[PDB]
Amino acid sequence: DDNSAITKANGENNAVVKINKTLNIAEGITTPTATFTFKFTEKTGQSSNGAPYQTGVAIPDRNVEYNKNDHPTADKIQKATEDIFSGVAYGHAGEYVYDVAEAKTGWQAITKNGKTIDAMRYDKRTYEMHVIVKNKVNGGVYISSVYFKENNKSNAPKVESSEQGVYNLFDNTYTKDASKEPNPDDPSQVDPNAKALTITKKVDGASGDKTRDFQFHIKIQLPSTNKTAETPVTNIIVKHGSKSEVLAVVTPADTVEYNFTLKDGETFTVEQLPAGSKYTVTETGVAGYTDSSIYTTNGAEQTSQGQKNVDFTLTDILIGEKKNDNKVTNKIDDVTPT
């Protein structure tokens, strides 16, 4: 404001403080089972006034639970604790200072035959909560003033709240490999071998040239959650085998671009990608041929019709946690003499 970084109390009633966890999650991803647990630990030291920090009052482990019914907005799910001071009663005035950190527990990866689909990166940050206790009249005490300061930082400024008495202290990201929950009505049936993307050219017609290449271009957008560890920096592409190439990730933009050719019945394959990524694909125009597409996006079937000799483009196709493929048909009208 200032000073809004500090949660006061109205009158002599205990200050109220919720802690808000931010889970970052991309677009094609089912929110996982995950409890995030905050762990308060009593710190020593000396208040401004000369007094040592007061101790001997415990704050319990506070937890937020995520499950399949939690759905992101702006690629993040935000859940808060209740009042952390619920069921906590101090004995005497003074400055109680707690180290608050988030424990690395309460989530497990999806696993099929020793192989792991997903990944949770836990917030490493650690804070200093200053609980400022002050005398009631006549007697007893109250939680007067609460504030946070990030630990291990140089001249750490006071932590500003998102909402009233709510602090986004802990921030974690979740990643998921694409296309490995292929059965749209049962994600327990899990395939670690499923490919990130498939594109398959099908030339259609008696006059159709089924030996030539059709020229393609693809730009893939890795999702924002990629920026948060651990992260992909190489991509593996198979334009019909044994052509196998390790394309690299453009680090400031998190994109990969490719140019490849397909012949009739020829499949383009992206080996593996974090679910949540997007792609643009473009087949250059070729004389006589109207192109069409039947694509699966995160288990959902969608279509797109093209023009006769124009470049055919698919604009920002999501590559979800479910099935991901594309079958692009190139159709040519029959040459018949009479």
Description:
This protein has no helices and 23 strands. It has 338 residues and is mainly beta. The chain has two domains: 1-178, no CATH class; 179-338, no CATH class. A seven-stranded mixed beta sheet has the order 16-15-18-13-23-20-21, with no helix packed on it. Keywords: Membrane, Transmembrane, Transmembrane helix. This is PitB. It comes from Streptococcus pneumoniae. Residues 196-313 form the DUF7601 domain. It is classed as cell adhesion.
Helix content: under 10%
Structural class: mainly beta
Beta-strand proportion: 35-45%
Q: Please write the string of helix (H) and strand (E) elements.
A: EEEEEEEEEEEEEEEEEEEEEEE
Write out the strand line-up for the largest beta sheet, numbering strands in chain order.
Answer: 16-15-18-13-23-20-21
The domain count comes to 2
Number of helices: 0
N-to-C CA distance: 83 Å
Tell me, what's the shape?
elongated
* Strand segment count: 23
Rounded radius of gyration (Å): 28 Å
Reported for the largest beta sheet, the result is:
7 strands, mixed
Quick recap of the structure?
The protein has 338 residues and is mostly beta strands.
